[PDB]
Amino acid sequence: KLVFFA
Amino acid sequence: KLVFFA
Amino acid sequence: KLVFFA
Amino acid sequence: KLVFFA
Ligand SMILES: O=S(=O)(O)c1cc(S(=O)(=O)O)c2c(/N=N/c3ccccc3)c(O)ccc2c1
Ligand SMILES: O=S(=O)(O)c1cc(S(=O)(=O)O)c2c(/N=N/c3ccccc3)c(O)ccc2c1
């Protein structure tokens, strides 16, 4: 599970 | 920018 | 720019 | 597997 906010 | 992967 | 999901 | 390059 990957979650990435940029 | 948002990236989700599962 | 490279993105690779395997 | 995840690969990122920039
Ligand atoms: O699924 S395949 O067998 O088709 C496969 C497998 C890999 S690999 O096993 O992750 O090695 C790569 C790969 N490697 N890319 C990395 C670069 C830097 C760090 C880690 C990995 C690459 O540059 C291009 C194509 C690939 C195809
Ligand atoms: O902070 S950075 O600007 O250096 C940056 C930028 C990106 S990126 O521009 O969104 O490309 C990524 C990234 N990309 N992830 C996607 C995967 C699938 C779809 C869309 C995007 C990733 O997997 C890992 C690290 C990253 C770091």
Author numbering:
A (entry chain A), B (entry chain B), C (entry chain C), D (entry chain D): 1 to 6
Publication text:
Although amyloid fibers and oligomers of two proteins, tau and amyloid-β, have been identified in association with this disease, the development of diagnostics and therapeutics has proceeded to date in a near vacuum of information about their structures. Here we report the first atomic structures of small molecules bound to amyloid. These are of the dye orange-G, the natural compound curcumin, and the Alzheimer's diagnostic compound DDNP bound to amyloid-like segments of tau and amyloid-β. Negatively charged orange-G wedges into a specific binding site between two sheets of the fiber, combining apolar binding with electrostatic interactions, whereas uncharged compounds slide along the cavity. The amyloid components in our structures are steric zippers formed by stacks of six-residue segments from Alzheimer-related proteins.
The KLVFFA segment (residues 16–21) from Aβ contains apolar residues that participate in a hydrophobic spine in Aβ fibers and itself acts as an inhibitor of Aβ fibrillation. We previously determined the atomic structure of the KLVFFA segment in three crystal forms; all show the common steric zipper motif associated with amyloid fibers (Colletier et al. unpublished results). The co-crystallization of KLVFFA with orange-G resulted in deeply colored crystals. Mass spectrometric analyses of the crystals showed high abundance of orange-G (∼1∶1 molar stoichiometry with KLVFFA). Determination of the structure revealed a novel, fourth form of the KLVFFA steric zipper, with orange-G wedged between the paired β-sheets of the zipper, leading to partial opening of the zipper. Stabilization of the binding arises from packing of the aromatic rings of orange-G against the apolar, partially aromatic spine of KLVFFA. At the interface between orange-G and KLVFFA, a total of 500 Å2 of apolar surface area is covered, corresponding very roughly to a binding energy of 9 kcal/mol, or a dissociation constant of ∼0.3 µM. Further stabilization arises from the salt links between the negatively charged sulfonic acid groups of orange-G and positively charged lysine side chains from both β-sheets. The differences in the binding cavities between the KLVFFA and VQIVYK fibers may account for the higher molecular stoichiometry within the KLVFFA-orange-G crystals observed by mass spectrometric analyses, and the correspondingly greater order of this complex.
